[PDB]
Amino acid sequence: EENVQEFVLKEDCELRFAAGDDSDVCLELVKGYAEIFGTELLLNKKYTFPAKSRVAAFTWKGATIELVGTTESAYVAESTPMVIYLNIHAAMEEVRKKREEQAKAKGPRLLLVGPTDVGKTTVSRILCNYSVRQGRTPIFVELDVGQNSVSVPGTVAAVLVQKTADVIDGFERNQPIVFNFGHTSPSANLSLYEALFKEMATTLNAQIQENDEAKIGGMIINTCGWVDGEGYKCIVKAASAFEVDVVIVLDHERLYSDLSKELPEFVRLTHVPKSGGVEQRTGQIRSKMRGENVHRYFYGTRANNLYPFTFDVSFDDVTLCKIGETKLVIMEPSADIKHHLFAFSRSTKADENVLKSPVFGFCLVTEVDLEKRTMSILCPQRTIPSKVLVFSDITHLD
Ligand SMILES: Nc1ncnc2c1ncn2[C@@H]1O[C@H](COP(=O)(O)OP(=O)(O)NP(=O)(O)O)[C@@H](O)[C@H]1O
Ligand SMILES: [Mg+2]
């Protein structure tokens, strides 16, 4: 945390680096202009990245960048797909302008698809940032229940993006619409997963009728990496449910070939390569990452800490329930709920409505005292926002 590496980037180059397993890396742009996944860097601002961060700082015009601290790897790459990503943004904006002159105008809807670790989340981040920098407010839709960049694992979620991502923390999640799926993969309950994203689409369609900026902002929709078997059919159903105009396939020629023959002819399908900077991650690291996501939901980040409450709740004061493949079941408080997330349902009653109701948020059950009929929960707020708690199979040791 003291030794220094200096890099000169020519136009259209990016510095790719990974922080050591053991320490922070601090990046500073010292000359020119640069961006990290679409967010512009401020000249001479010091950006501190935590252990194991994997980052690319790209420049359109040329830049000089300093890194302070131990890196596992740091090199300048001279060939990237960045112009491709920019041209996708450019095309979307063109569509917005055309529909604005025709008109309230509906923004383009883009579905990003492809297998795991082709940079789908990063590309969605770049596209959302570019939209924001264009003065638009797109809706980012997260359909990946495993690796979710909006809420905890086991959710389908959407958020109006009004500010570029923080280079370190990612997007500010200002009042997301969140549905509790309750599993880390769609395969655990396919019919529910489909019902949820269709409910999401319906909800969003009504929301944007009341908000013209969001309506023309359009949608950038991230799917999970499940592209084979039933995962393929989910992509097709998502494209239909969200009425997408554009499908971007990342690094999967077969999937691109299949969708070309299946999607309605009006849908523009674009195949794009993955960046050579994308890290291929193991199941083990993916699991640790879901864990860190849960931790972040309650405790926030090093930049912006959250201070969650720990208090006891009487089993007389709540109803516990679980979905599933369609039926709600009332759960009797038990030892087996310990370590599980529960969602605070927006439905006032534990009835048919829970299934299609969004949630206020989550709590984590840390202890269960069956004798006293109480549980200890970790919760974002001082009191529970709902008396209806919906089971999630996602567990976390805090
Ligand atoms: N051009 C790049 N240079 C360096 N690192 C990158 C680059 N693009 C992506 N990464 C990093 O590689 C990792 C994987 O990127 P990500 O966009 O999450 O892939 P993904 O396809 O969404 N993976 P998943 O959805 O979990 O199957 C993250 O740490 C990114 O920050
Ligand atoms: Mg992803």
JSON list of C-alpha atoms in Angstrom, two decimals, residues 38-255:
[
{"chain": "A", "resi": 38, "resn": "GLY", "atom": "CA", "xyz": [-19.18, 3.78, -18.20]},
{"chain": "A", "resi": 39, "resn": "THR", "atom": "CA", "xyz": [-18.74, 6.13, -15.23]},
{"chain": "A", "resi": 40, "resn": "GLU", "atom": "CA", "xyz": [-16.37, 9.02, -15.96]},
{"chain": "A", "resi": 41, "resn": "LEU", "atom": "CA", "xyz": [-13.40, 9.33, -13.57]},
{"chain": "A", "resi": 42, "resn": "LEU", "atom": "CA", "xyz": [-12.62, 12.66, -11.96]},
{"chain": "A", "resi": 43, "resn": "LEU", "atom": "CA", "xyz": [-9.10, 13.93, -12.64]},
{"chain": "A", "resi": 44, "resn": "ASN", "atom": "CA", "xyz": [-6.81, 13.50, -9.58]},
{"chain": "A", "resi": 45, "resn": "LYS", "atom": "CA", "xyz": [-9.56, 11.89, -7.48]},
{"chain": "A", "resi": 46, "resn": "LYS", "atom": "CA", "xyz": [-8.26, 8.87, -5.58]},
{"chain": "A", "resi": 47, "resn": "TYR", "atom": "CA", "xyz": [-10.48, 5.79, -5.98]},
{"chain": "A", "resi": 48, "resn": "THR", "atom": "CA", "xyz": [-9.81, 3.07, -3.40]},
{"chain": "A", "resi": 49, "resn": "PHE", "atom": "CA", "xyz": [-10.70, -0.45, -4.57]},
{"chain": "A", "resi": 50, "resn": "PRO", "atom": "CA", "xyz": [-10.95, -3.31, -2.08]},
{"chain": "A", "resi": 51, "resn": "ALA", "atom": "CA", "xyz": [-9.11, -6.66, -2.14]},
{"chain": "A", "resi": 52, "resn": "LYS", "atom": "CA", "xyz": [-9.94, -8.82, -5.18]},
{"chain": "A", "resi": 53, "resn": "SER", "atom": "CA", "xyz": [-11.58, -5.96, -7.16]},
{"chain": "A", "resi": 54, "resn": "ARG", "atom": "CA", "xyz": [-11.41, -6.58, -10.91]},
{"chain": "A", "resi": 55, "resn": "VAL", "atom": "CA", "xyz": [-11.56, -3.34, -12.88]},
{"chain": "A", "resi": 56, "resn": "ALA", "atom": "CA", "xyz": [-11.00, -1.81, -16.31]},
{"chain": "A", "resi": 57, "resn": "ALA", "atom": "CA", "xyz": [-10.38, 1.89, -16.79]},
{"chain": "A", "resi": 58, "resn": "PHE", "atom": "CA", "xyz": [-10.96, 2.70, -20.46]},
{"chain": "A", "resi": 59, "resn": "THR", "atom": "CA", "xyz": [-10.13, 5.90, -22.30]},
{"chain": "A", "resi": 60, "resn": "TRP", "atom": "CA", "xyz": [-11.58, 7.18, -25.61]},
{"chain": "A", "resi": 61, "resn": "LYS", "atom": "CA", "xyz": [-8.85, 9.81, -26.06]},
{"chain": "A", "resi": 62, "resn": "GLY", "atom": "CA", "xyz": [-5.81, 8.78, -23.99]},
{"chain": "A", "resi": 63, "resn": "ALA", "atom": "CA", "xyz": [-4.96, 8.90, -20.31]},
{"chain": "A", "resi": 64, "resn": "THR", "atom": "CA", "xyz": [-2.26, 8.51, -17.68]},
{"chain": "A", "resi": 65, "resn": "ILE", "atom": "CA", "xyz": [-3.21, 6.49, -14.61]},
{"chain": "A", "resi": 66, "resn": "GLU", "atom": "CA", "xyz": [-1.39, 5.75, -11.32]},
{"chain": "A", "resi": 67, "resn": "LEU", "atom": "CA", "xyz": [-2.09, 2.67, -9.15]},
{"chain": "A", "resi": 68, "resn": "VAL", "atom": "CA", "xyz": [-0.90, 2.64, -5.57]},
{"chain": "A", "resi": 69, "resn": "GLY", "atom": "CA", "xyz": [-0.68, -0.70, -3.72]},
{"chain": "A", "resi": 70, "resn": "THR", "atom": "CA", "xyz": [-0.19, -4.39, -4.53]},
{"chain": "A", "resi": 71, "resn": "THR", "atom": "CA", "xyz": [-1.92, -5.71, -7.64]},
{"chain": "A", "resi": 72, "resn": "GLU", "atom": "CA", "xyz": [-2.40, -9.34, -8.62]},
{"chain": "A", "resi": 73, "resn": "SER", "atom": "CA", "xyz": [-2.28, -8.19, -12.25]},
{"chain": "A", "resi": 74, "resn": "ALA", "atom": "CA", "xyz": [-2.21, -4.87, -14.08]},
{"chain": "A", "resi": 75, "resn": "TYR", "atom": "CA", "xyz": [-1.81, -4.35, -17.81]},
{"chain": "A", "resi": 76, "resn": "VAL", "atom": "CA", "xyz": [-3.00, -2.10, -20.64]},
{"chain": "A", "resi": 77, "resn": "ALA", "atom": "CA", "xyz": [-5.19, -3.82, -23.25]},
{"chain": "A", "resi": 78, "resn": "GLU", "atom": "CA", "xyz": [-5.23, -2.19, -26.71]},
{"chain": "A", "resi": 79, "resn": "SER", "atom": "CA", "xyz": [-8.23, -3.99, -28.16]},
{"chain": "A", "resi": 80, "resn": "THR", "atom": "CA", "xyz": [-11.67, -3.93, -26.54]},
{"chain": "A", "resi": 81, "resn": "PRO", "atom": "CA", "xyz": [-15.31, -4.16, -27.72]},
{"chain": "A", "resi": 82, "resn": "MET", "atom": "CA", "xyz": [-16.03, -0.70, -26.24]},
{"chain": "A", "resi": 83, "resn": "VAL", "atom": "CA", "xyz": [-17.09, 0.94, -29.53]},
{"chain": "A", "resi": 84, "resn": "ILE", "atom": "CA", "xyz": [-19.58, -1.90, -29.99]},
{"chain": "A", "resi": 85, "resn": "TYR", "atom": "CA", "xyz": [-21.11, -1.10, -26.59]},
{"chain": "A", "resi": 86, "resn": "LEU", "atom": "CA", "xyz": [-21.18, 2.64, -27.51]},
{"chain": "A", "resi": 87, "resn": "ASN", "atom": "CA", "xyz": [-22.86, 1.92, -30.83]},
{"chain": "A", "resi": 88, "resn": "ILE", "atom": "CA", "xyz": [-25.58, -0.09, -29.04]},
{"chain": "A", "resi": 89, "resn": "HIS", "atom": "CA", "xyz": [-26.22, 2.92, -26.86]},
{"chain": "A", "resi": 90, "resn": "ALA", "atom": "CA", "xyz": [-26.15, 5.19, -29.93]},
{"chain": "A", "resi": 91, "resn": "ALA", "atom": "CA", "xyz": [-28.76, 3.06, -31.72]},
{"chain": "A", "resi": 92, "resn": "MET", "atom": "CA", "xyz": [-31.05, 3.03, -28.68]},
{"chain": "A", "resi": 93, "resn": "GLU", "atom": "CA", "xyz": [-30.90, 6.82, -28.41]},
{"chain": "A", "resi": 94, "resn": "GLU", "atom": "CA", "xyz": [-31.74, 7.08, -32.13]},
{"chain": "A", "resi": 95, "resn": "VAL", "atom": "CA", "xyz": [-34.86, 4.98, -31.49]},
{"chain": "A", "resi": 96, "resn": "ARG", "atom": "CA", "xyz": [-35.82, 7.28, -28.58]},
{"chain": "A", "resi": 97, "resn": "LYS", "atom": "CA", "xyz": [-35.48, 10.37, -30.79]},
{"chain": "A", "resi": 98, "resn": "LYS", "atom": "CA", "xyz": [-37.55, 8.81, -33.60]},
{"chain": "A", "resi": 99, "resn": "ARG", "atom": "CA", "xyz": [-40.31, 7.88, -31.17]},
{"chain": "A", "resi": 100, "resn": "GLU", "atom": "CA", "xyz": [-40.15, 11.34, -29.54]},
{"chain": "A", "resi": 101, "resn": "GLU", "atom": "CA", "xyz": [-40.80, 13.04, -32.92]},
{"chain": "A", "resi": 102, "resn": "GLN", "atom": "CA", "xyz": [-43.57, 10.52, -33.64]},
{"chain": "A", "resi": 103, "resn": "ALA", "atom": "CA", "xyz": [-45.40, 11.29, -30.38]},
{"chain": "A", "resi": 104, "resn": "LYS", "atom": "CA", "xyz": [-46.13, 9.69, -24.87]},
{"chain": "A", "resi": 105, "resn": "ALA", "atom": "CA", "xyz": [-43.03, 8.10, -26.43]},
{"chain": "A", "resi": 106, "resn": "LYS", "atom": "CA", "xyz": [-41.93, 4.60, -25.36]},
{"chain": "A", "resi": 107, "resn": "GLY", "atom": "CA", "xyz": [-38.21, 3.96, -24.97]},
{"chain": "A", "resi": 108, "resn": "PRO", "atom": "CA", "xyz": [-36.44, 0.95, -26.54]},
{"chain": "A", "resi": 109, "resn": "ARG", "atom": "CA", "xyz": [-36.17, -2.24, -24.50]},
{"chain": "A", "resi": 110, "resn": "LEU", "atom": "CA", "xyz": [-32.99, -4.22, -24.62]},
{"chain": "A", "resi": 111, "resn": "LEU", "atom": "CA", "xyz": [-32.51, -7.80, -23.46]},
{"chain": "A", "resi": 112, "resn": "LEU", "atom": "CA", "xyz": [-28.97, -8.91, -22.74]},
{"chain": "A", "resi": 113, "resn": "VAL", "atom": "CA", "xyz": [-28.45, -12.68, -22.99]},
{"chain": "A", "resi": 114, "resn": "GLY", "atom": "CA", "xyz": [-25.61, -15.17, -22.95]},
{"chain": "A", "resi": 115, "resn": "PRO", "atom": "CA", "xyz": [-23.90, -17.77, -20.81]},
{"chain": "A", "resi": 116, "resn": "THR", "atom": "CA", "xyz": [-22.17, -17.14, -17.48]},
{"chain": "A", "resi": 117, "resn": "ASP", "atom": "CA", "xyz": [-19.13, -14.83, -17.35]},
{"chain": "A", "resi": 118, "resn": "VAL", "atom": "CA", "xyz": [-19.31, -13.12, -20.68]},
{"chain": "A", "resi": 119, "resn": "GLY", "atom": "CA", "xyz": [-19.53, -9.71, -19.00]},
{"chain": "A", "resi": 120, "resn": "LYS", "atom": "CA", "xyz": [-23.30, -9.33, -19.11]},
{"chain": "A", "resi": 121, "resn": "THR", "atom": "CA", "xyz": [-23.66, -7.35, -15.88]},
{"chain": "A", "resi": 122, "resn": "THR", "atom": "CA", "xyz": [-20.71, -5.12, -16.88]},
{"chain": "A", "resi": 123, "resn": "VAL", "atom": "CA", "xyz": [-22.23, -4.47, -20.29]},
{"chain": "A", "resi": 124, "resn": "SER", "atom": "CA", "xyz": [-25.63, -3.66, -18.67]},
{"chain": "A", "resi": 125, "resn": "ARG", "atom": "CA", "xyz": [-23.76, -1.22, -16.40]},
{"chain": "A", "resi": 126, "resn": "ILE", "atom": "CA", "xyz": [-22.00, 0.45, -19.31]},
{"chain": "A", "resi": 127, "resn": "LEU", "atom": "CA", "xyz": [-25.28, 0.81, -21.28]},
{"chain": "A", "resi": 128, "resn": "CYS", "atom": "CA", "xyz": [-27.18, 2.22, -18.25]},
{"chain": "A", "resi": 129, "resn": "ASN", "atom": "CA", "xyz": [-24.35, 4.71, -17.56]},
{"chain": "A", "resi": 130, "resn": "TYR", "atom": "CA", "xyz": [-24.31, 5.82, -21.18]},
{"chain": "A", "resi": 131, "resn": "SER", "atom": "CA", "xyz": [-28.07, 6.36, -21.08]},
{"chain": "A", "resi": 132, "resn": "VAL", "atom": "CA", "xyz": [-27.72, 8.48, -17.93]},
{"chain": "A", "resi": 133, "resn": "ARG", "atom": "CA", "xyz": [-24.83, 10.49, -19.45]},
{"chain": "A", "resi": 134, "resn": "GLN", "atom": "CA", "xyz": [-27.14, 11.10, -22.42]},
{"chain": "A", "resi": 135, "resn": "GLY", "atom": "CA", "xyz": [-29.66, 12.67, -19.99]},
{"chain": "A", "resi": 136, "resn": "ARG", "atom": "CA", "xyz": [-32.05, 9.69, -19.96]},
{"chain": "A", "resi": 137, "resn": "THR", "atom": "CA", "xyz": [-33.33, 7.67, -17.02]},
{"chain": "A", "resi": 138, "resn": "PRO", "atom": "CA", "xyz": [-33.59, 4.02, -18.08]},
{"chain": "A", "resi": 139, "resn": "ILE", "atom": "CA", "xyz": [-35.04, 1.22, -15.99]},
{"chain": "A", "resi": 140, "resn": "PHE", "atom": "CA", "xyz": [-32.57, -1.51, -15.21]},
{"chain": "A", "resi": 141, "resn": "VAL", "atom": "CA", "xyz": [-34.27, -4.89, -14.84]},
{"chain": "A", "resi": 142, "resn": "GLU", "atom": "CA", "xyz": [-32.47, -7.70, -13.11]},
{"chain": "A", "resi": 143, "resn": "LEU", "atom": "CA", "xyz": [-33.77, -11.18, -13.84]},
{"chain": "A", "resi": 144, "resn": "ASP", "atom": "CA", "xyz": [-30.70, -13.04, -12.51]},
{"chain": "A", "resi": 145, "resn": "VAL", "atom": "CA", "xyz": [-31.77, -14.58, -9.20]},
{"chain": "A", "resi": 146, "resn": "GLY", "atom": "CA", "xyz": [-28.24, -15.91, -8.51]},
{"chain": "A", "resi": 147, "resn": "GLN", "atom": "CA", "xyz": [-25.94, -12.99, -9.18]},
{"chain": "A", "resi": 148, "resn": "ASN", "atom": "CA", "xyz": [-28.23, -10.04, -8.62]},
{"chain": "A", "resi": 149, "resn": "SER", "atom": "CA", "xyz": [-26.89, -6.48, -8.79]},
{"chain": "A", "resi": 150, "resn": "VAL", "atom": "CA", "xyz": [-30.11, -4.82, -7.50]},
{"chain": "A", "resi": 151, "resn": "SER", "atom": "CA", "xyz": [-31.25, -6.77, -4.43]},
{"chain": "A", "resi": 152, "resn": "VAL", "atom": "CA", "xyz": [-30.36, -9.98, -2.54]},
{"chain": "A", "resi": 153, "resn": "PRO", "atom": "CA", "xyz": [-30.02, -13.36, -4.30]},
{"chain": "A", "resi": 154, "resn": "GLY", "atom": "CA", "xyz": [-33.36, -15.03, -5.01]},
{"chain": "A", "resi": 155, "resn": "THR", "atom": "CA", "xyz": [-35.03, -11.87, -6.28]},
{"chain": "A", "resi": 156, "resn": "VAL", "atom": "CA", "xyz": [-36.19, -10.44, -9.57]},
{"chain": "A", "resi": 157, "resn": "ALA", "atom": "CA", "xyz": [-35.78, -6.65, -9.33]},
{"chain": "A", "resi": 158, "resn": "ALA", "atom": "CA", "xyz": [-35.97, -3.36, -11.19]},
{"chain": "A", "resi": 159, "resn": "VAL", "atom": "CA", "xyz": [-34.65, 0.12, -10.52]},
{"chain": "A", "resi": 160, "resn": "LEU", "atom": "CA", "xyz": [-34.92, 3.52, -12.17]},
{"chain": "A", "resi": 161, "resn": "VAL", "atom": "CA", "xyz": [-31.39, 4.64, -12.92]},
{"chain": "A", "resi": 162, "resn": "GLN", "atom": "CA", "xyz": [-30.96, 8.40, -12.45]},
{"chain": "A", "resi": 163, "resn": "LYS", "atom": "CA", "xyz": [-27.25, 8.58, -11.68]},
{"chain": "A", "resi": 164, "resn": "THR", "atom": "CA", "xyz": [-24.19, 6.87, -13.10]},
{"chain": "A", "resi": 165, "resn": "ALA", "atom": "CA", "xyz": [-22.85, 3.98, -11.03]},
{"chain": "A", "resi": 166, "resn": "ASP", "atom": "CA", "xyz": [-20.38, 4.82, -8.28]},
{"chain": "A", "resi": 167, "resn": "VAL", "atom": "CA", "xyz": [-17.05, 3.52, -9.69]},
{"chain": "A", "resi": 168, "resn": "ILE", "atom": "CA", "xyz": [-16.44, 1.58, -6.48]},
{"chain": "A", "resi": 169, "resn": "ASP", "atom": "CA", "xyz": [-20.00, 0.77, -5.20]},
{"chain": "A", "resi": 170, "resn": "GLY", "atom": "CA", "xyz": [-22.03, 0.36, -8.41]},
{"chain": "A", "resi": 171, "resn": "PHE", "atom": "CA", "xyz": [-25.51, 1.78, -8.85]},
{"chain": "A", "resi": 172, "resn": "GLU", "atom": "CA", "xyz": [-27.37, 3.54, -6.07]},
{"chain": "A", "resi": 173, "resn": "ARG", "atom": "CA", "xyz": [-30.46, 1.46, -5.66]},
{"chain": "A", "resi": 174, "resn": "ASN", "atom": "CA", "xyz": [-33.16, 4.10, -5.13]},
{"chain": "A", "resi": 175, "resn": "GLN", "atom": "CA", "xyz": [-36.41, 2.32, -4.16]},
{"chain": "A", "resi": 176, "resn": "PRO", "atom": "CA", "xyz": [-36.19, -0.83, -6.32]},
{"chain": "A", "resi": 177, "resn": "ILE", "atom": "CA", "xyz": [-39.26, -2.90, -7.18]},
{"chain": "A", "resi": 178, "resn": "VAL", "atom": "CA", "xyz": [-38.37, -6.30, -5.76]},
{"chain": "A", "resi": 179, "resn": "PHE", "atom": "CA", "xyz": [-40.06, -9.71, -6.06]},
{"chain": "A", "resi": 180, "resn": "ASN", "atom": "CA", "xyz": [-38.99, -12.53, -3.81]},
{"chain": "A", "resi": 181, "resn": "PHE", "atom": "CA", "xyz": [-38.37, -15.60, -5.92]},
{"chain": "A", "resi": 182, "resn": "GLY", "atom": "CA", "xyz": [-36.61, -17.31, -2.99]},
{"chain": "A", "resi": 183, "resn": "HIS", "atom": "CA", "xyz": [-34.13, -19.53, -4.85]},
{"chain": "A", "resi": 184, "resn": "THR", "atom": "CA", "xyz": [-30.68, -19.04, -6.42]},
{"chain": "A", "resi": 185, "resn": "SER", "atom": "CA", "xyz": [-31.65, -20.49, -9.81]},
{"chain": "A", "resi": 186, "resn": "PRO", "atom": "CA", "xyz": [-34.85, -20.42, -11.95]},
{"chain": "A", "resi": 187, "resn": "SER", "atom": "CA", "xyz": [-34.69, -24.25, -12.21]},
{"chain": "A", "resi": 188, "resn": "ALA", "atom": "CA", "xyz": [-35.80, -24.51, -8.58]},
{"chain": "A", "resi": 189, "resn": "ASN", "atom": "CA", "xyz": [-39.28, -23.23, -9.61]},
{"chain": "A", "resi": 190, "resn": "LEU", "atom": "CA", "xyz": [-39.69, -22.41, -13.31]},
{"chain": "A", "resi": 191, "resn": "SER", "atom": "CA", "xyz": [-43.40, -21.58, -13.27]},
{"chain": "A", "resi": 192, "resn": "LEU", "atom": "CA", "xyz": [-42.99, -19.16, -10.35]},
{"chain": "A", "resi": 193, "resn": "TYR", "atom": "CA", "xyz": [-39.91, -17.55, -11.99]},
{"chain": "A", "resi": 194, "resn": "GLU", "atom": "CA", "xyz": [-41.93, -16.97, -15.21]},
{"chain": "A", "resi": 195, "resn": "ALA", "atom": "CA", "xyz": [-44.95, -15.67, -13.24]},
{"chain": "A", "resi": 196, "resn": "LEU", "atom": "CA", "xyz": [-42.62, -13.25, -11.42]},
{"chain": "A", "resi": 197, "resn": "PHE", "atom": "CA", "xyz": [-40.93, -11.73, -14.44]},
{"chain": "A", "resi": 198, "resn": "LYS", "atom": "CA", "xyz": [-44.31, -11.41, -16.15]},
{"chain": "A", "resi": 199, "resn": "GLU", "atom": "CA", "xyz": [-45.69, -9.71, -13.03]},
{"chain": "A", "resi": 200, "resn": "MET", "atom": "CA", "xyz": [-42.63, -7.46, -13.07]},
{"chain": "A", "resi": 201, "resn": "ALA", "atom": "CA", "xyz": [-43.30, -6.54, -16.73]},
{"chain": "A", "resi": 202, "resn": "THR", "atom": "CA", "xyz": [-46.98, -5.81, -16.01]},
{"chain": "A", "resi": 203, "resn": "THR", "atom": "CA", "xyz": [-46.05, -3.67, -12.98]},
{"chain": "A", "resi": 204, "resn": "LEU", "atom": "CA", "xyz": [-43.41, -1.72, -14.95]},
{"chain": "A", "resi": 205, "resn": "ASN", "atom": "CA", "xyz": [-45.82, -1.11, -17.84]},
{"chain": "A", "resi": 206, "resn": "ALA", "atom": "CA", "xyz": [-48.31, 0.50, -15.46]},
{"chain": "A", "resi": 207, "resn": "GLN", "atom": "CA", "xyz": [-45.55, 2.44, -13.57]},
{"chain": "A", "resi": 208, "resn": "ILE", "atom": "CA", "xyz": [-44.27, 4.12, -16.76]},
{"chain": "A", "resi": 209, "resn": "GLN", "atom": "CA", "xyz": [-47.79, 5.33, -17.66]},
{"chain": "A", "resi": 210, "resn": "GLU", "atom": "CA", "xyz": [-47.36, 7.76, -14.73]},
{"chain": "A", "resi": 211, "resn": "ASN", "atom": "CA", "xyz": [-43.73, 8.73, -15.46]},
{"chain": "A", "resi": 212, "resn": "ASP", "atom": "CA", "xyz": [-42.84, 10.04, -18.91]},
{"chain": "A", "resi": 213, "resn": "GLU", "atom": "CA", "xyz": [-39.07, 10.16, -18.27]},
{"chain": "A", "resi": 214, "resn": "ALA", "atom": "CA", "xyz": [-38.94, 6.52, -17.21]},
{"chain": "A", "resi": 215, "resn": "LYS", "atom": "CA", "xyz": [-41.15, 5.58, -20.19]},
{"chain": "A", "resi": 216, "resn": "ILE", "atom": "CA", "xyz": [-38.79, 7.08, -22.78]},
{"chain": "A", "resi": 217, "resn": "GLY", "atom": "CA", "xyz": [-35.77, 5.97, -20.71]},
{"chain": "A", "resi": 218, "resn": "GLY", "atom": "CA", "xyz": [-36.57, 2.44, -21.90]},
{"chain": "A", "resi": 219, "resn": "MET", "atom": "CA", "xyz": [-35.27, -0.75, -20.31]},
{"chain": "A", "resi": 220, "resn": "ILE", "atom": "CA", "xyz": [-32.00, -2.61, -20.04]},
{"chain": "A", "resi": 221, "resn": "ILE", "atom": "CA", "xyz": [-32.82, -6.16, -18.94]},
{"chain": "A", "resi": 222, "resn": "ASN", "atom": "CA", "xyz": [-30.13, -8.55, -17.56]},
{"chain": "A", "resi": 223, "resn": "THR", "atom": "CA", "xyz": [-30.92, -12.29, -17.74]},
{"chain": "A", "resi": 224, "resn": "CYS", "atom": "CA", "xyz": [-29.22, -15.10, -15.88]},
{"chain": "A", "resi": 225, "resn": "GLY", "atom": "CA", "xyz": [-26.52, -17.21, -17.55]},
{"chain": "A", "resi": 226, "resn": "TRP", "atom": "CA", "xyz": [-28.82, -20.27, -18.00]},
{"chain": "A", "resi": 227, "resn": "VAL", "atom": "CA", "xyz": [-29.01, -20.58, -21.83]},
{"chain": "A", "resi": 228, "resn": "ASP", "atom": "CA", "xyz": [-29.48, -24.37, -22.33]},
{"chain": "A", "resi": 229, "resn": "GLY", "atom": "CA", "xyz": [-32.65, -26.45, -21.86]},
{"chain": "A", "resi": 230, "resn": "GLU", "atom": "CA", "xyz": [-35.39, -24.67, -19.89]},
{"chain": "A", "resi": 231, "resn": "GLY", "atom": "CA", "xyz": [-33.13, -21.61, -19.52]},
{"chain": "A", "resi": 232, "resn": "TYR", "atom": "CA", "xyz": [-33.47, -21.02, -23.26]},
{"chain": "A", "resi": 233, "resn": "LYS", "atom": "CA", "xyz": [-37.27, -21.00, -23.01]},
{"chain": "A", "resi": 234, "resn": "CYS", "atom": "CA", "xyz": [-36.99, -18.41, -20.18]},
{"chain": "A", "resi": 235, "resn": "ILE", "atom": "CA", "xyz": [-35.08, -16.07, -22.53]},
{"chain": "A", "resi": 236, "resn": "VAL", "atom": "CA", "xyz": [-37.81, -16.37, -25.18]},
{"chain": "A", "resi": 237, "resn": "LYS", "atom": "CA", "xyz": [-40.60, -15.83, -22.58]},
{"chain": "A", "resi": 238, "resn": "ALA", "atom": "CA", "xyz": [-38.72, -12.81, -21.15]},
{"chain": "A", "resi": 239, "resn": "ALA", "atom": "CA", "xyz": [-38.34, -11.29, -24.62]},
{"chain": "A", "resi": 240, "resn": "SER", "atom": "CA", "xyz": [-42.12, -11.66, -25.10]},
{"chain": "A", "resi": 241, "resn": "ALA", "atom": "CA", "xyz": [-43.17, -10.50, -21.58]},
{"chain": "A", "resi": 242, "resn": "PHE", "atom": "CA", "xyz": [-41.03, -7.34, -21.74]},
{"chain": "A", "resi": 243, "resn": "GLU", "atom": "CA", "xyz": [-41.86, -6.70, -25.42]},
{"chain": "A", "resi": 244, "resn": "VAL", "atom": "CA", "xyz": [-38.18, -6.13, -26.18]},
{"chain": "A", "resi": 245, "resn": "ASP", "atom": "CA", "xyz": [-37.02, -4.34, -29.36]},
{"chain": "A", "resi": 246, "resn": "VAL", "atom": "CA", "xyz": [-33.39, -5.47, -29.21]},
{"chain": "A", "resi": 247, "resn": "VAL", "atom": "CA", "xyz": [-31.66, -8.63, -28.08]},
{"chain": "A", "resi": 248, "resn": "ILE", "atom": "CA", "xyz": [-27.92, -8.54, -27.48]},
{"chain": "A", "resi": 249, "resn": "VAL", "atom": "CA", "xyz": [-26.31, -11.96, -27.41]},
{"chain": "A", "resi": 250, "resn": "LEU", "atom": "CA", "xyz": [-22.85, -12.01, -25.74]},
{"chain": "A", "resi": 251, "resn": "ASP", "atom": "CA", "xyz": [-20.44, -14.70, -27.02]},
{"chain": "A", "resi": 252, "resn": "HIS", "atom": "CA", "xyz": [-22.80, -17.52, -28.00]},
{"chain": "A", "resi": 253, "resn": "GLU", "atom": "CA", "xyz": [-23.17, -18.21, -31.68]},
{"chain": "A", "resi": 254, "resn": "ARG", "atom": "CA", "xyz": [-25.59, -21.14, -31.31]},
{"chain": "A", "resi": 255, "resn": "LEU", "atom": "CA", "xyz": [-27.86, -19.13, -29.01]}
]
